[PDB]
Design a protein around this ligand. Structure first.
Ligand SMILES: [K+]
Ligand SMILES: [K+]
Ligand SMILES: [K+]
Ligand SMILES: [K+]
Ligand SMILES: [K+]
Ligand SMILES: [K+]
Ligand SMILES: [K+]
Ligand SMILES: [K+]
Ligand SMILES: [K+]
Ligand SMILES: [K+]
Ligand SMILES: [Mg+2]
Ligand SMILES: [Mg+2]
Ligand SMILES: [Mg+2]
Ligand SMILES: [Mg+2]
Ligand SMILES: [Mg+2]
Ligand SMILES: [Mg+2]
Ligand SMILES: [Mg+2]
Ligand SMILES: [Mg+2]
Ligand SMILES: [Mg+2]
Ligand SMILES: [Mg+2]
Ligand SMILES: [Mg+2]
Ligand SMILES: [Mg+2]
Ligand SMILES: [Mg+2]
Ligand SMILES: [Mg+2]
Ligand SMILES: [Mg+2]
Ligand SMILES: [Mg+2]
Ligand SMILES: [Mg+2]
Ligand SMILES: [Mg+2]
Ligand SMILES: [Mg+2]
Ligand SMILES: [Mg+2]
Ligand SMILES: [Mg+2]
Ligand SMILES: [Mg+2]
Ligand SMILES: [Mg+2]
Ligand SMILES: [Mg+2]
Ligand SMILES: [Mg+2]
Ligand SMILES: [Mg+2]
Ligand SMILES: [Mg+2]
Ligand SMILES: [Mg+2]
Ligand SMILES: [Zn+2]
Lengths: 70, 50, 101, 100, 82, 208
RNA sequence: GGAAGGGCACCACCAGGCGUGGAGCCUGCGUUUGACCAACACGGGGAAACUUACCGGUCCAGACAAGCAGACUGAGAGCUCUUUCUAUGGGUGGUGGUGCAUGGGUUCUUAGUUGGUGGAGCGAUUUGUCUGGUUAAUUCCGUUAACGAACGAGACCUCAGCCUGCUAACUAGCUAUGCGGAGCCCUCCGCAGCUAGCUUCUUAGAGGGACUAUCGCCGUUUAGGCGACGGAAGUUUGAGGCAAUAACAGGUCUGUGAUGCCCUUAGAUGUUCUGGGCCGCACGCGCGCUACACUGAUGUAUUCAACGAGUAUAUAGCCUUGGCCGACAGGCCCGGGUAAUCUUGGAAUUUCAUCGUGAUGGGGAUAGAUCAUUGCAAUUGGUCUUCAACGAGGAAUGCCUAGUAAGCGCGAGUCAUCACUCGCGUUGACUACGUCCCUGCCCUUUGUACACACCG
C-alpha cells in the first residue's frame, strides 16, 4: 500500500505515515470477515472497501463527512 | 479507565491550591488558577508596586 | 590560586548590600585582592491578573511585580579561606552559591 | 487591448499575475511595452508558452490544477460530500450570512 | 473496597516503620509516591481507618495528610501480632 | 539543574503550602506563622504558636519535622522543625482572629467575645484595634457589625507594615461568619513591638 | 425641583484629532449557563479529546458498621469463564437549585465622614463640620459657643526625568598601543596584552538635586496666585499603587475539603471512556481586524528600539546558533544556554522604478486544486488559480490636551496546534489651556402634599 498513499493527497500521506491504532485493523478485519455500526470516523478511505452509518452524536476523505448531528 | 490520552490539555492540569480546570496560570510554573493565586500573592511574594 | 566565584541572590536590597559589604571586608581582612562587588542587573517578574473571581463588573487587573537582585564576587584565593570567610552568620532572604572560577 | 501583458492576460480565466509573469518572461518577450503594440509574430509564441507549461519547464508546483482525482495540469454534489453540499470551512456563522 | 493481603501488609509496614502518611488525590497515578502500591487502594484503606479513630486527617491543597496516635500504633501491633 | 526563577517560585508556593497545612492543624493551639532559613546543610523551619506547651505534647514535633522531610522529598538530617512562643499574643492579628473564633464556637455571645478580644489587644499595648464581623448572627438577614477604637489608618504605604490584619471564615451552626481583626502597632525603634520606622505623620523634636 | 448663587470634570461641552454606526471579516449577546452608565473579545470563556455543567454502554470512589476460549456491544466494555456482595443504620461526590441564608462596582476620583466634653432645643436633631480669601483637597489663614481630637486628603511607596560627583564592574563597556587586513604616516576591520589605563559611555547602589528661593505685580500687612531669570525640572515634575463612613437584596454557591437548607446517594444529577454540541442563521445589536487607493499598491536597495521569555537531556520536550537539503512550507547533522555569557549579530520610515485615476497592480471576501507541520486522532501554515461587497458611510454615537492623540511593529498571557488582553518601543502633530450651554458631581440658601424618596 505504497503507490496508493504516494498518489493520495497530502493529508492521507501524512496520516498513514504517522501510524495507525488498534481499532483500525479491528475494523478492517471485521469488514473483510463480514464480506457497519461503529462510531469511529477518523479512517481515511483507501480503495480497500469501495463496494454506511456512523453515530452522529445524536442518534481520499475521512469518514468524518456523513456524521451529521443536526 | 482514563483511556483517553491525558498527556496535555486542561484534563491533566489543575490548580495546585483549588483544582479548577479554568483560569490556569502557568508562567514560571505557578500551576494555579487566578483566584487562588491572587489569594496567596502576599504569601508567594507577589506584592503590588504600581 | 584557584580563583573562586561567589554569587549572592536575594529579593531585598538592604540585606544583600550589607552582607556583600561584610563579605568583601572580611576578604580584605586576609589581605586579598577582590574584583568587585559586581551588581548583577536586577531581573523583574511581572504578572497581571483579574481581581474579580467571576468576570462580572468592569475589568480591573492588578499587576504583581517581584524584583530579584544579585551580586557577584571573584576572589583570587584558595577555596578554603573563602569557605572560612563565608562560614560566618547570615541574614534571611540571601542565598550564597560558590563555584570554581 | 491597452493593459500591459504583465496583467493583460489576468483577464482570461485560469491565469493571474503569477502565470502572466511566468509566461511573459519565459518566451524572451519584451516587458516594458503595452499589449496594443504586440503583434502576431509573438502571439503564437505566447499561446505556445501558455498552453504547454510542463514542456516549457514550468515548476511542477506552479500548476494550479494539481494531480486530479491523475496528471499535473494547468461532482462533489453527486457523491454526497459535505464540501459540495455546503460554510465548508467551519465558520462561526451565528452573525454572518445576512446577504439574503 | 477489596484489598489484597500483601498490599495491606505493605501499607501497614509503611505506616509502622515510618509513622507519617501523605497522599495525592490522583488514582490515575498507579504508584503511591514512595511505595509501588496504587494510590486508590491506600487512600480507601485509610478512609476506612478514618472512622476508627486510629488516624487524624489534614487536607491542604488537594493533598491528604494523616497523623498517627497511640490507637494507630497499637492497632498495627494487634494486626501484626508483634 | 533548576533555574533560579523556578526555584524561587517553588519556595514561595512551598511556604504558602506550609502555612496552609500548619494553620489547619494547630486550631487547638493557635498557629501564628513560621520562619524558614537555609543554613549550610540545614533547613530550619520554626513554627509559632500562642500556646506552645501543647505543640510539644516533643515527639509530635519530630513527626512534623519528618513531615516536610518526606512529603516534600527533602533530604534527611538537613531539615529541622521546632515550636516557639509568641512574643505578644494580643499584638498578633491571627492569634486574636482564631481566639475570637474559638470564643464564639465555645458558646459565648459574639458581642462579649469581641469586647474581650478588644480589651486584650489594648492589654497588649496596641495603638488601635478594629474587629469586623459580617454575616447572619441571629436573623436570616446578614449584617456587618464593627467595633473600632484607637488610631486606625486606612490608606498608603504605611498600611502594609504599621498594621497587622487577619481574616477568618468560621463555620457556625447556621452558616459561615466572616471575622476580620486589624491592629495598629506603635513605633518601636528596636522593632520588637511593631515596625522599626516611625510614621510619616509622626515627628519627634529634640528640646533646645 | 423645567428654583436662586458658588465650584469642579475630555467616562461633559466649546476648538479640534481620530473613529464607530455604512462594506467584508472574524467574536459576544438575543446546540450548558451566568451578566442587561455598572451585560454584550466578560467569566482571563482563542471549547478537535477532558474543560463539559447539554445529549451509549461503567465501575462504586456505598466508608464505617442482619446474612453467603463463543456471541453482542463502538469497545471478549459488559455477558459465557475465573473467584472466595447484601436487608438496613449512614457516609463521600454533585459545575444541581438557592448570590433574596450567607462568608471572602468606574456610587466616588469626588472631598467627604464621625466620637468626647461644652452651648441651643421638650424632642427628632443641631453647633464643632463656618462669613470671607485661597487650595486638586474639610488644604490652609482666619471668623468663631465651641474646645480638643479620630479617619479620608495630604503625608507614604514604585518607576521615569538630571548628576563628566562617589561606590565598581573578565557574564558590561570606552581609549591608546602591539599584532595581523587593505589603500611609513594617515584612513581603516579583526585579534590579544590575567591591569595599557578609565567607568565619561551600560549596569546598580549609597547619595545629591526642587523647597516655590530670589525678581516684579496682585492679594490683607495672612493663606496664597500670576508673570520673570536661573535651573534637567517651577503643574506638589510626570505616571501610577494604597485609598474613609453608609449602602446596593449589584456580581460570584459553576474557583475554593467556605458553608446552611432543599434535592440525587445505586436502572446515581459524581465518577471512567466513546461520539456530538456549544462553531445554527431567514434575523437585531455590541467590541475590534482589513479597505475605499497615486500621501498608494508593487518591485529593488540604506537601516535605527525597548519589555520579557527561554530546557527532564530520555538522540531530544524550551530558546534556539551554525552547516547541509528543500522554490516556499518543511527535514538531517554540528552544538550552546538551566542564562547580562547562547537565542539577542536583534516595521512604518528612506534614495530608485512599473503603475496613471480606470472598482485598477487599492481591496481580497469566497471557491477549487495541491504539500507539510501540530496533535493519538484535523487546527494552522506554503504554491497557483477565483477576484464579492467596498468610490469616506443617514438618525445616533465613543476616546483624547503632549512625546499625548493618531500610525507602525515586538514580547508575554492564552498553547500538543491556532491571536483578544496586559506591557514594550518607534514616527509624531491640530486645537484648547475656557466654561457650566448640554451630560453630571459637590456645597449654600429656598420650596415640597415625596421618604420604595420625581421611574415620587
Ligand atoms: K479559576
Ligand atoms: K445570518
Ligand atoms: K464607520
Ligand atoms: K468586555
Ligand atoms: K457577597
Ligand atoms: K455633642
Ligand atoms: K594598526
Ligand atoms: K464564591
Ligand atoms: K452548594
Ligand atoms: K480576492
Ligand atoms: Mg488570474
Ligand atoms: Mg493619614
Ligand atoms: Mg495619599
Ligand atoms: Mg470623552
Ligand atoms: Mg476626564
Ligand atoms: Mg466638539
Ligand atoms: Mg474610520
Ligand atoms: Mg456594526
Ligand atoms: Mg449592521
Ligand atoms: Mg458564547
Ligand atoms: Mg479551537
Ligand atoms: Mg467527553
Ligand atoms: Mg471545555
Ligand atoms: Mg463610578
Ligand atoms: Mg469611596
Ligand atoms: Mg451633648
Ligand atoms: Mg559612567
Ligand atoms: Mg530630589
Ligand atoms: Mg441581590
Ligand atoms: Mg468544590
Ligand atoms: Mg460530574
Ligand atoms: Mg461557528
Ligand atoms: Mg475590551
Ligand atoms: Mg515601498
Ligand atoms: Mg535600532
Ligand atoms: Mg487594488
Ligand atoms: Mg480586492
Ligand atoms: Mg480570549
Ligand atoms: Zn485555584
Amino acid at each position: 500500500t505504497e503507490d496508493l498513499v504516494q498518489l493520495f493527497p497530502a493529508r492521507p500521506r501524512r496520516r498513514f505515515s504517522r501510524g495507525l491504532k488498534r481499532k483500525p485493523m479491528a475494523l478492517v478485519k471485521k469488514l473483510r470477515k463480514a464480506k457497519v455500526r461503529t462510531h469511529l470516523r477518523n479512517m481515511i478511505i483507501m480503495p480497500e472497501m469501495i463496494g454506511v452509518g456512523i453515530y452522529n452524536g445524536k442518534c481520499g476523505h475521512y469518514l468524518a463527512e456523513f456524521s451529521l448531528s443536526y | 479507565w482514563n483511556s483517553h490520552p491525558k498527556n496535555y490539555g486542561p484534563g491533566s492540569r489543575v490548580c495546585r491550591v483549588c483544582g479548577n480546570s479554568h483560569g490556569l496560570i502557568r508562567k514560571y510554573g505557578l500551576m494555579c488558577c487566578r483566584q487562588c493565586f491572587r489569594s496567596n500573592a502576599k504569601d508567594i511574594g507577589f506584592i503590588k508596586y504600581r | 590560586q584557584h580563583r573562586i566565584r561567589i554569587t549572592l541572590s536575594s529579593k531585598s536590597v538592604k540585606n544583600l548590600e550589607k552582607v556583600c559589604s561584610d563579605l568583601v571586608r572580611g576578604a580584605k581582612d586576609k589581605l586579598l585582592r577582590v574584583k568587585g562587588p559586581v551588581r548583577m542587573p536586577t531581573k523583574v517578574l511581572n504578572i497581571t491578573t483579574r481581581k474579580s473571581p467571576c468576570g462580572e463588573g468592569t475589568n480591573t487587573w492588578d499587576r504583581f511585580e517581584m524584583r530579584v537582585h544579585k551580586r557577584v564576587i571573584d576572589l583570587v584565593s584558595s577555596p578554603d579561606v573563602v569557605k572560612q570567610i563565608t562560614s560566618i552568620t547570615i541574614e534571611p532572604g540571601v542565598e550564597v552559591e560558590v563555584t570554581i572560577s | 487591448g491597452k493593459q500591459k501583458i504583465m496583467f493583460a492576460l489576468t483577464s482570461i480565466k485560469g491565469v493571474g499575475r503569477r502565470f502572466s509573469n511566468i509566461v511573459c518572461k519565459k518566451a524572451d518577450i519584451d516587458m516594458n511595452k503595452r499589449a496594443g503594440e504586440l503583434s502576431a509574430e509573438e502571439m503564437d509564441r505566447l499561446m505556445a508558452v501558455v498552453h504547454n507549461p510542463r514542456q516549457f519547464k514550468v515548476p511542477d508546483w506552479f500548476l494550479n490544477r494539481k494531480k486530479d482525482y491523475g496528471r499535473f495540469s494547468q461532482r462533489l454534489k453527486k457523491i454526497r460530500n459535505h464540501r459540495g453540499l455546503r460554510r465548508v470551512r467551519g465558520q462561526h456563522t451565528k452573525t454572518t450570512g445576512r446577504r439574503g | 473496597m477489596i484489598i489484597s493481603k500483601k498490599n495491606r501488609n505493605e501499607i501497614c509496614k509503611y505506616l509502622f516503620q515510618e509513622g507519617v502518611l501523605y497522599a495525592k488525590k490522583d488514582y490515575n497515578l498507579a504508584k503511591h509516591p514512595q511505595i509501588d502500591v496504587p494510590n486508590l487502594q491506600v487512600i480507601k484503606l485509610m478512609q476506612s481507618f478514618k472512622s476508627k479513630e486510629y488516624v487524624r486527617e489534614t487536607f491542604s491543597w488537594q493533598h491528604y495528610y494523616w497523623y498517627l496516635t497511640n490507637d494507630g500504633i497499637e492497632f498495627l501491633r494487634n494486626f501484626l501480632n508483634l | 539543574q533548576i533555574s533560579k526563577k523556578k526555584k524561587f517560585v517553588s519556595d514561595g508556593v512551598f511556604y504558602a503550602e506550609l502555612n496552609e497545612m500548619l494553620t489547619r492543624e494547630l486550631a487547638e493551639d493557635g498557629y501564628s506563622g513560621v520562619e524558614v532559613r537555609v543554613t549550610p546543610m540545614r533547613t530550619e523551619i520554626i513554627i509559632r504558636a500562642t500556646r506552645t506547651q501543647n505543640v510539644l505534647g516533643g515527639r509530635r514535633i519530630r513527626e512534623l519535622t519528618s513531615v516536610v522531610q518526606k512529603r516534600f522529598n527533602f533530604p534527611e538530617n538537613g531539615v529541622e522543625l521546632y515550636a516557639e512562643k509568641v512574643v505578644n499574643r494580643g499584638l498578633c492579628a491571627i492569634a486574636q482572629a482564631e481566639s475570637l473564633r474559638y470564643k464564639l464556637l465555645g458558646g459565648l455571645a459574639v458581642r462579649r467575645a469581641c469586647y474581650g478580644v478588644l480589651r486584650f489587644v489594648m492589654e497588649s499595648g496596641a495603638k488601635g484595634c478594629e474587629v469586623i464581623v459580617s454575616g447572619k448572627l441571629r436573623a436570616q438577614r446578614a449584617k456587618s457589625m464593627k467595633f473600632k477604637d484607637g488610631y486606625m489608618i486606612s490608606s498608603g504605604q504605611p498600611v502594609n507594615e504599621y498594621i497587622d490584619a487577619a481574616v477568618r471564615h468560621v463555620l457556625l451552626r447556621q452558616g459561615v461568619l466572616g471575622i476580620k481583626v486589624k491592629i495598629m502597632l506603635d513605633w518601636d525603634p528596636k522593632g520588637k513591638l511593631g515596625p522599626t520606622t516611625p510614621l510619616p505623620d509622626l515627628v519627634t523634636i529634640h528640646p533646645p
